[PDB]
Design a protein around this ligand. Structure first.
Ligand SMILES: *[C@@H]1O[C@H](CO)[C@@H](O[C@@H]2O[C@H](CO)[C@@H](O[C@@H]3O[C@H](CO)[C@@H](O)[C@H](O[C@H]4O[C@H](CO)[C@@H](O)[C@H](O)[C@@H]4O[C@H]4O[C@H](CO)[C@@H](O)[C@H](O)[C@@H]4O)[C@@H]3O)[C@H](O)[C@H]2NC(C)=O)[C@H](O)[C@H]1NC(C)=O
Ligand SMILES: *[C@@H]1O[C@H](CO)[C@@H](O[C@@H]2O[C@H](CO)[C@@H](O)[C@H](O)[C@H]2NC(C)=O)[C@H](O)[C@H]1NC(C)=O
Ligand SMILES: *[C@@H]1O[C@H](CO)[C@@H](O[C@@H]2O[C@H](CO)[C@@H](O)[C@H](O)[C@H]2NC(C)=O)[C@H](O)[C@H]1NC(C)=O
Ligand SMILES: *[C@@H]1O[C@H](CO)[C@@H](O[C@@H]2O[C@H](CO)[C@@H](O)[C@H](O)[C@H]2NC(C)=O)[C@H](O)[C@H]1NC(C)=O
Ligand SMILES: *[C@@H]1O[C@H](CO)[C@@H](O[C@@H]2O[C@H](CO)[C@@H](O)[C@H](O)[C@H]2NC(C)=O)[C@H](O)[C@H]1NC(C)=O
Ligand SMILES: *[C@@H]1O[C@H](CO)[C@@H](O[C@@H]2O[C@H](CO)[C@@H](O)[C@H](O)[C@H]2NC(C)=O)[C@H](O)[C@H]1NC(C)=O
Ligand SMILES: *[C@@H]1O[C@H](CO)[C@@H](O[C@@H]2O[C@H](CO)[C@@H](O)[C@H](O)[C@H]2NC(C)=O)[C@H](O)[C@H]1NC(C)=O
Ligand SMILES: *[C@@H]1O[C@H](CO)[C@@H](O[C@@H]2O[C@H](CO)[C@@H](O)[C@H](O)[C@H]2NC(C)=O)[C@H](O)[C@H]1NC(C)=O
Ligand SMILES: *[C@@H]1O[C@H](CO)[C@@H](O)[C@H](O)[C@H]1NC(C)=O
Ligand SMILES: *[C@@H]1O[C@H](CO)[C@@H](O)[C@H](O)[C@H]1NC(C)=O
Ligand SMILES: *[C@@H]1O[C@H](CO)[C@@H](O)[C@H](O)[C@H]1NC(C)=O
Ligand SMILES: *[C@@H]1O[C@H](CO)[C@@H](O)[C@H](O)[C@H]1NC(C)=O
Ligand SMILES: *[C@@H]1O[C@H](CO)[C@@H](O)[C@H](O)[C@H]1NC(C)=O
Ligand SMILES: *[C@@H]1O[C@H](CO)[C@@H](O)[C@H](O)[C@H]1NC(C)=O
Ligand SMILES: *[C@@H]1O[C@H](CO)[C@@H](O)[C@H](O)[C@H]1NC(C)=O
Lengths: 440, 128, 43
């Protein structure tokens, strides 16, 4: 009575992993030739945001199993490694350093911080050396026991000059999926992290993503839309971290207020590196500001969201972070050539029951990006002063009776992107279908 | 509606949207090799065979060209005999599809055997 | 002082190996085989 009738082009999918590629908003850069993020050799985005809504259909997501995280976290390491390759290797830099302090008569926090130093650097000739005076930081040199100092890297890694024409500004990146695939979108406000979004829609290619590297906080990111939103995986576990998204930003100012000087020395036949030569004016601490009353009002929204499903009749105690590396302890971020380390003990000294603010900031030169013992990038110094202004969007916490300790955590860079990929998943389109009908 | 516009709709209502489903399939000449050029090369490849492997299957199933065509193999009613006049324009494609999913492998080999083996001989048998 | 077939086979040796610093060297004692070293003419 009924025979099998085939159907082609049926709107049905499954869930699958696939390769996925760049999409840039086409601009006229032509200045730093290419940045770290290869915006050049990327396809220009269609300026038609075709965003097709899906009616009366639901789908449970999981922000904790997005393979899009693992694809992109592979790529960010790899692009970083790819651009870092063709520049100068500072192999002969690892020498014995005669050093002393730079401003020996100083009372401030910057006392004993910058260190004048001395070399015997190999020139471009084979049998000619050179005594070189330079400046370094506390967080770059190690004593040996004008006591002899030595850099950090030589314990573990090697050194690459960081190509002093490229930039580091995080370009917004779109991700177009290939044909025969689609990217779902949740669009549900107050989404849990794992649940059936009713208001789904889909696109070919996601919105802008700025791949910024940050610890303890989420600079420059995407806002929320309704309120403070809490996400985590196992709220009853102490191993899972805490994802916080804020409905409003905080304008952070940050600066490195020193008028500097960069010198250059040919050390090989073409190898000429740049170093922190001299400081004009006099030595000033680098710091960051924040509106205190705005931030308390911001933090007052947080604890209300906390006490909803956790610790109603229980005090909420914030503590400073525990310890370990600086990347897992303090706020760390690049801001266009400099790698800041701002102490954040003055933001987690607070409890609850039932006129600005200044953070001191350190900077380094030798960076171990993504915990890869074996690689160490030497950033070049920057002339002039730095005037970084940024928003804030997120917060990374962890939980340590009727007492609760929330310490600020971080470490994994992949948690930065789950804050940007929870709205999406990858589906494989299936244009087949077989039904019984009345025809033979 | 649009591409995947009738996703949670009636199968008869979503019967008349197949062209938009098929147009929105499959650039930059002179690629380099570095990082993104690998993925764009991979983007070109995966669009081909995922377009093509089922395009083989319609020639396997004799339903060459875009046709909502029907076969000559009867529907086995052991495969969830549920009101096939009624339910055919009630639920969705989607939720109905995973119901079929336990037996689709059994169907397909019979599809390439029913009219594709037998009824593709017999026109040669009358070709005299 | 060995009578067997392994006599004169393993050779204690000495170096001046460059360390991780540029201007620091290091005397290193190691062991090698007959089929790895060649005389030059504690030779
Ligand atoms: C969060 O988002 C905000 C956006 O609101 C980001 O803030 C912007 O940050 C950029 C870079 O940090 C900053 O751009 C600078 O503006 C200056 C004033 O116009 C420019 O003069 C300066 O350009 C110089 O530096 C660039 C990088 O080296 C070069 O590409 C450029 O050619 C210039 O370089 C010349 O001058 C320097 C001077 O020392 C010299 O050394 C060079 O060799 C060369 O000769 C910057 O482009 C924006 O002004 C910021 N916007 C605001 C509103 O503050 C913020 O950075 C984001 N947060 C994070 C963490 O990234
Ligand atoms: C680092 O210390 C050295 C110590 O020798 C400084 O070199 C001398 O500096 C004085 C005044 O600054 C000069 O008069 C001498 O001629 C310098 N000696 C040599 C051999 O050049 C050096 O100036 C210090 N570095 C900085 C940036 O001040
Ligand atoms: C939000 O997510 C949490 C998990 O992080 C869900 O909590 C559990 O959900 C399962 C299945 O829904 C239940 O069986 C458990 O009893 C829930 N445990 C607790 C402590 O709630 C929660 O249901 C999700 N909420 C929504 C609205 O989706
Ligand atoms: C930082 O946050 C501010 C708000 O505090 C953003 O400024 C708003 O940007 C949107 C989008 O362009 C505008 O519609 C608003 O009018 C802006 N408000 C004000 C007061 O200017 C700013 O865009 C954010 N910048 C970054 C880099 O995230
Ligand atoms: C979330 O983590 C909590 C721990 O805080 C887990 O709860 C305990 O898990 C252990 C090992 O599975 C059990 O022996 C205990 O009996 C559990 N305690 C309770 C009160 O259930 C919990 O299983 C984790 N849940 C998820 C979904 O990961
Ligand atoms: C960060 O610095 C900028 C400028 O250095 C501040 O912007 C000024 O803000 C005041 C009041 O908010 C305005 O009256 C000025 O017109 C602004 N000037 C400019 C050039 O934008 C900003 O307020 C600072 N942020 C904080 C939190 O102090
Ligand atoms: C950030 O600054 C605070 C300033 O108090 C530092 O906290 C002090 O740390 C030392 C070293 O353990 C203790 O002896 C003091 O008792 C601490 N002060 C207080 C008030 O508790 C903190 O160490 C700084 N952050 C980092 C990462 O060093
Ligand atoms: C290789 O020969 C050297 C010859 O100096 C040996 O070094 C000495 O060994 C004796 C006993 O083995 C020690 O008491 C001395 O202190 C060693 N000298 C030094 C400078 O360390 C060495 O032991 C031999 N190698 C092996 C594996 O036996
Ligand atoms: C550089 O070499 C000279 C002579 O070789 C030596 O006296 C001096 O101590 C060396 N300085 C450093 C910093 O290596
Ligand atoms: C070398 O690394 C070890 C741990 O890997 C550390 O304890 C030691 O302080 C490091 N030495 C230097 C000079 O950094
Ligand atoms: C730094 O010093 C130079 C010296 O010529 C001066 O021209 C420049 O304006 C100074 N910059 C700042 C920010 O003080
Ligand atoms: C922050 O505000 C709350 C109430 O809004 C108040 O109880 C608390 O004392 C304030 N903290 C600071 C440091 O001002
Ligand atoms: C917290 O701040 C109070 C004053 O605001 C100060 O007395 C106390 O030492 C601080 N504690 C910590 C752990 O920062
Ligand atoms: C229908 O499928 C069942 C198994 O579910 C099988 O036993 C039966 O023989 C099939 N009917 C026909 C006519 O092939
Ligand atoms: C090592 O160097 C010292 C002094 O430079 C020299 O006396 C010795 O013979 C050298 N040994 C070897 C094995 O090169």
């Amino acid at each position: 009575n009924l025979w099998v009738t085939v159907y082609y082009g049926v709107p049905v999918w499954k869930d699958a992993e696939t390769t996925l590629f760049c999409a840039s908003d086409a601009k006229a850069y032509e200045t730093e030739k290419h940045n770290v993020w290869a915006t050049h050799e990327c396809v220009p985005t269609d300026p038609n945001p075709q965003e097709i809504h899906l009616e009366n259909v639901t789908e449970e997501f999981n922000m904790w199993k997005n393979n899009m995280v693992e694809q992109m976290h592979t790529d960010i390491i790899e692009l970083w490694d790819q651009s870092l390759k063709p520049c100068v290797k500072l192999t002969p830099l690892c020498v014995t350093l005669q050093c002393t302090n730079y401003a020996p008569k100083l009372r401030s926090m910057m006392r004993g911080e910058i260190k004048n130093c001395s070399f015997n650097m190999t020139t471009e000739l084979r049998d000619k050396k050179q005594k070189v005076y330079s400046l370094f930081y506390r967080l770059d040199v190690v004593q040996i026991n004008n006591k002899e100092y030595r850099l950090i890297n030589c314990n573990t890694s090697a050194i690459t000059q960081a190509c002093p024409k490229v930039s580091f500004e995080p370009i917004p990146i779109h991700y177009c999926a290939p044909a025969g695939f689609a990217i779902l979108k949740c669009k549900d406000k107050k989404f849990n992290g794992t649940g059936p979004c009713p208001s789904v829609s889909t696109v070919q290619c996601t919105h802008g993503i700025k791949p910024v590297v940050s610890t303890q906080l989420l600079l420059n990111g995407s806002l929320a839309e309704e309120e403070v939103i809490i996400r985590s995986e196992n709220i009853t576990n102490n191993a899972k971290n805490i994802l916080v998204q804020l409905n409003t930003p905080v304008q952070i100012n940050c600066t490195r207020p020193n008028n500097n000087t960069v010198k250059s020395i040919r050390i090989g036949p073409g190898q000429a590196f740049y170093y922190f030569g001299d400081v004009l004016g006099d030595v000033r601490m680098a710091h960051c500001n924040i509106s205190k009353a705005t931030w308390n009002e911001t933090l007052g929204k947080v604890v209300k969201q906390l006490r909803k499903h956790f610790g109603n009749n229980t005090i909420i105690r914030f503590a400073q972070s525990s310890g370990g590396d600086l990347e897992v302890t303090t706020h760390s971020f690049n801001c266009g050539g400099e790698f800041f380390y701002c102490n954040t003990s003055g933001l987690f000294n607070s409890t609850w029951i039932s006129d600005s603010l200044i953070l001191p900031c350190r900077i380094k030169q030798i960076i171990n990006m993504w915990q890869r013992i074996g690689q160490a990038m030497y950033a070049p110094p920057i002339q002039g002063v730095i005037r970084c202004v940024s928003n804030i969007t997120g917060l990374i916490l962890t939980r340590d009776s009727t007492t609760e300790t929330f310490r600020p955590g971080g470490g994994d860079m992949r948690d930065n992107w789950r804050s940007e990929l929870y709205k999406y998943k990858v589906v494989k389109i299936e244009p087949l279908g077989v039904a019984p009908t009345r025809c033979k | 509606l649009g591409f995947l516009g009738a996703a949670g709709s009636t199968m008869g209502a979503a019967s008349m949207t197949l062209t938009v489903q098929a147009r929105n399939l499959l650039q930059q000449h002179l690629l380099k090799l570095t990082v993104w050029g690998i993925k764009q090369l991979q983007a070109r490849v995966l669009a081909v065979e995922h377009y093509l492997r089922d395009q083989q299957l319609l020639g396997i199933w004799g339903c060459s060209g875009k046709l909502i065509c029907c076969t000559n193999v009867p529907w086995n009613s052991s495969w969830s005999n549920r009101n096939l006049s009624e339910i055919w324009d009630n639920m969705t494609w989607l939720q109905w599809d995973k119901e079929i999913s336990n037996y689709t492998q059994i169907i397909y080999g019979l599809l390439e055997e029913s009219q594709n083996q037998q009824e593709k001989n017999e026109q040669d048998l009358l070709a005299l």
